[PDB]
Amino acid sequence: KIDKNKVRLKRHARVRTNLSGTAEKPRLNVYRSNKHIYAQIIDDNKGVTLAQASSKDSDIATTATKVELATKVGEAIAKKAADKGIKEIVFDRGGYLYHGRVKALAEAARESGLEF
Amino acid sequence: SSTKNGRDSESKRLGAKRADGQFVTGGSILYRQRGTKIYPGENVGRGGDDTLFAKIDGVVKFERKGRDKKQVSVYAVA
Amino acid sequence: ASLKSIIRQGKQTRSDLKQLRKSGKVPAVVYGYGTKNVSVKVDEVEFIKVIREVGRNGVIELGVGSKTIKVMVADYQFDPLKNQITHIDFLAI
Amino acid sequence: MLLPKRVKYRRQHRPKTTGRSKGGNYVTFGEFGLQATTTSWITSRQIESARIAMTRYMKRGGKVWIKIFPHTPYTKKPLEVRMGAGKGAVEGWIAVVKPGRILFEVAGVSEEVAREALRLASHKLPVKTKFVKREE
Amino acid sequence: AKLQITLTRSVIGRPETQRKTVEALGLKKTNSSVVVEDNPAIRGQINKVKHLVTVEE
RNA sequence: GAUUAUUGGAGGUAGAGCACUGUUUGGUCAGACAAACUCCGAAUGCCAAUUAAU
RNA sequence: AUAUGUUAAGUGGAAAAGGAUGUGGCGUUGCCCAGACAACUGGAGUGCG
RNA sequence: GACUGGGGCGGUCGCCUCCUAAAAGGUAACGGAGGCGCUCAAAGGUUCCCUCAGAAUGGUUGGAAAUCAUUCAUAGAGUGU
RNA sequence: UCUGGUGACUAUAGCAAGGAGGUCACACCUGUUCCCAUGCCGAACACAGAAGUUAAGCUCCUUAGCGACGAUGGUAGUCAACUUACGUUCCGCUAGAGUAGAACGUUGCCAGGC
């Protein structure tokens, strides 16, 4: 192969010259795998993580292919995040094209109270 | 015989205008340069023709970050 | 054979080094196992009467405060216009 | 006639001639050398004349390594001219020595032959040299 | 206090920094004097012009 | 306003070195040269703190 | 005046490449009691006419 | 018309970058070495992805530099002038 | 601690040869029914996913050959001073570049499951 993860960190580093905002515009990480999708809200004030979702727990990831999770894993943050007291987020692509599972999570996040 | 030479451009005053540690105001010019010898840092904006200046008014620092690269930052409280 | 040195204590200026080499003695330093950077003086007329018995790579027994700490000759420092020796590096084995 | 093929600039500033030699103080190939003790320029005609003088007395029974080369060119303007209005063309090529630098080396010949073979070349060079053998 | 200083050599023929330093110590003419207590600042100004003045206790 | 003492920082001279651009002697190894070469790089000077002493 | 060593050219009181058994200091070597170097008596080897 | 190591004759006059310029800026000579008096309707704005020169091996041998694939590369290509 | 995300100290973290491991996960891997993709190509970016394996990647460990880091000691320069014209000397500060010894197979932050 051509190091599928080592090319993403090359693409992620050129996304994130701008987007590293703090304390009212936090990032919202995205990541993928062959099986899952991971996400967490962070901001760069020497390390603060506010909410962290996943798709490996005993709540989801018992269901069909990859996307009805990734539309309903957006609301796993979007339930917790505004109930932690966050609003006015910024989202990164994480190195991926805004498409498919990543396009599903972003649109589903602001439909249930995580405004942009 | 003759000379084909002489003929120079005059000058452009091109160096550090403020120094490390002093209170600079909201629009002071902090460096004049060709290219980016010294990068813009935080609360510092790189202008067109690469002459980096300050944005919020506070102290200045010239700080190093890489192997052979440098940056200029401005911090708020004095 | 073996040298027999003293300890060059304190630290002194370049004129006192320049008043030292007229008496013949060449400064040196010793490092290595447990020696921890002692500074000596080496007499050049006596230091060459050692080299023609053990070689340019031999083993000597340098007495730094009556401690024959069995050093080797690592580095010269030479001046070709005046034909002397300027600084010698010993390492303890 | 020792000169470089191409130089990036034909008119250079004059080299500095005070201090002591940068490097090239020790005999490293041969067995007997000729180190200068005074500073001067040498202008590549007085190396054609001190090389051949060493060659004849040796009867070509050894090797000769010259360890300097004129890199820097030096200018001059023709006679009966006024000052200024330019800078003159290249006349020749110089090489700077400083006291300590080995000039010549020999190898493959005896000592008492080479000591009377380097004297025939120091009288065609300006500087005061002496006879240095190898580091032992 | 201590460190009685005295100006002996004059400032006629000396640079612009070796005249400002002498005027800092309070030395006007030849064979003037001051009495100033020892410091890291005063005892650093003395070797600036220690070829001019004489310092004594 | 000036002067040192302590402190921070900008910058590529002297010197030195060939890692680059050109020069160069003897068999990848040993050696050399540089105003318009630099992996490096002082001594001083310069701008400052709003800190103490004259 | 004093305590110590150096210079013999008027050096001090005009300047170089090179030459030089002038003289004083600091070191290093090889022969020397079988008494040494110098003079002194009877091996294709160093200049000669 | 003026500068001009007397005047004439030759040369040069404004803007740009380097060196002399002495590690802040500044700094002269008829000192050393080059350009400019324009060009782009995409070679401008923004968004999403890709990384180069050459070297070496192989084969219609187009010297492996026409085109063609693999390694090695640390910036040795390129950036309207 | 032990794995994964994620920024920091930024070759003392690197590069290269060896050696070990895998339902917890990351991968490798099969597919084109569709959104989506090639200026040639499911190689890639997407997208579906019973099965197939530790081989390369990543992960852990050790060897210091290469790169990086690097004292003390001395020299080169040099601000100030004193004679001096000599390709200078003597005295007092500061202190290089190269070279020897050596440090070195990373020290840590925060949320998530063991």
The answer to whether residues B1 and D84 touch, using CB atoms and an 8 Å cutoff, is: no
Residue pair D129/D86 in contact by the 8 Å Cβ criterion: no
Q: CA geometry: angle at B77 spanning B17 and A88, to 5°?
A: 110
End-to-end CA distance of chain C: 17
B residues 3-22 lying closer than 8 A (beta carbon) to D: 3
Among B62, B57, B63, residue whose Cα is nearest residue B75: B57
Among candidate residues B40, B41, B36, B34, the one with its CA nearest the CA of residue B13: B34
Strands C71-75 and C88-92: antiparallel
CA atoms within 13 A on the CB side of C22: 4
Distance CA D36, CA D21 (A): 10
- What's at D35, amino acid-wise? Q
The chain C residue lying nearest D102, using CA atoms, is: C80
Report the alpha-carbon distance of residue D7 to residue A102 in Å, rounded.
62
Nearby residues of A27 by Cβ (< 8 Å), 6 or more positions away: A19, A20, A21, A41, A42, A43, A44, A90, A91, A92
Which residue, A28, A11, A37, is CA-closest to A82? A28
Query: Under 8 Å CB-to-CB from A25, ≥6 apart: which residues?
Result: A43, A88, A89, A90
Cβ <8 Å between D100 and C81: yes
D26 to C80: CB separation less than 8 angstroms, yes or no: yes
Q: Is D132 on the interface with C (CB under 8 A)?
A: yes
3-state SS assignment for residue E1: coil
Assess C80–D contact: CB distance below 8 Å, yes or no: yes
Residues D73 and D10: beta-carbon distance below 8 Å: yes
C78 in reach of chain D (CB within 8 A): yes
Structure tokens at E17: 């920094």
As a whole number of angstroms, the distance between CA A48 and CA A71 comes to: 25
Q: Do D99 and C81 touch (CB under 8 A)?
A: yes
Which contacts (CB < 8 Å, 24+ apart) does range B12-19 have?
A: B18/B60, B19/B60
H helix intervals, chain A: 8-15, 68-72, 74-84, 101-111
Identify each DSSP E strand in A7-92 by its residue range. Answer: 27-32, 37-43, 48-53
Please give the single-letter amino acid code of residue D130. K
Contact by Cβ (8 Å): C71, C32: yes
User: Does the CB of C52 sit below 7 A from strand I?
Assistant: no
CA angle D118, D124, D126 (to 5 degrees): 105
Nearest CA in chain D to C80: D100
Q: Is B60 helix (H, G, I), strand (E, B) or coil?
A: strand
CB D60 within 8 Å of CB D117: no
Q: Is residue D80 less than 8 Å (CB to CB) from chain C?
A: no
User: Which one, of D93, D100, D97, D37, lies nearest residue D70 by Cα?
Assistant: D93
Task: Give chains near E: 3+ CB pairs under 8 A.
Answer: none
Which residues 36-55 on B are within 7 A of strand H at the CB atom?
A: none
Listed residue (C82, C86, C76, C93) closest to C41, CA to CA: C86
Q: Give the separation between CA C67 and CA C5, rounded to whole angstroms.
A: 10
A114: how many CB neighbours lie within 10 A of its CB? 25
Which amino acid is it at D94?
Answer: I
Are C73 and C85 within 8 A, CB to CB? Answer: no
Q: Which residues have C-beta within 8 Å of that of residue C73, sequence separation ≥ 6?
A: C51, C56, C57, C58, C60, C88, C89, C90
Nearest residue of D to residue B6, measured between CA atoms: D86
Are chains B and D in contact at 3+ CB pairs closer than 8 Å? yes
| D97 vs C contacts (CB less than 8 Å) | none
Residues A105, A89 contacting (CB under 8 angstroms): no
Q: H helices within chain E, ranges in order?
A: 17-25, 42-46
Task: With CA atoms as reference, report the closest residue to A106 among A33, A39, A8, A34.
Answer: A39
Q: Which chains touch C (3 or more CB pairs under 8 A)?
A: D
Contact predicate A53/A116, CB 8 Å: no
* DSSP state for residue B24 in the 8-state scheme: B
| Helix or strand (DSSP H, E) at C17 | helix C14-18
| Sequential DSSP letters for D30-51 | SSEEEEE-S-EEE-SSTTHHHH
Round to a whole number and report the distance in Å from the CA of C25 to the C1' of I74.
Answer: 14
Torsion of CA B12, B13, B14, B19, to 10 degrees: -170
Q: What residues have CB less than 8 Å from C1, skipping those under 6 apart?
A: C49, C50, C53, C54, C60
Residue C15: φ, ψ to 5°: -75, -35
Beta-sheet pairing, C38-43 with C84-85:
unpaired
DSSP string spanning chain D?
----S--S-SS-PPPP--S--SS--S--SSSEEEEE-S-EEE-SSTTHHHHHHHHHHTTT-SEEEE-----EEEE-PPSS--S-SS-PPEEEEEEEE-TT-EEEEEESS-HHHHTTTSHHHHTSSSS-EEEEE---
Contact residues on chain D for C81, CB-CB shorter than 8 A: 37, 99-100
Resolution for the entry shown, Å? 3.6
Does nucleic acid strand F have an atom less than 7 angstroms from the CB of B27?
A: no
- Is the CB of residue C45 less than 8 Å away from at least one CB of chain D? no
Terminal-to-terminal C-alpha distance of chain B:
64
- This entry's atomic model was obtained through cryo-EM
- Supply φ then ψ for residue B72, to 5 degrees: -120, 125
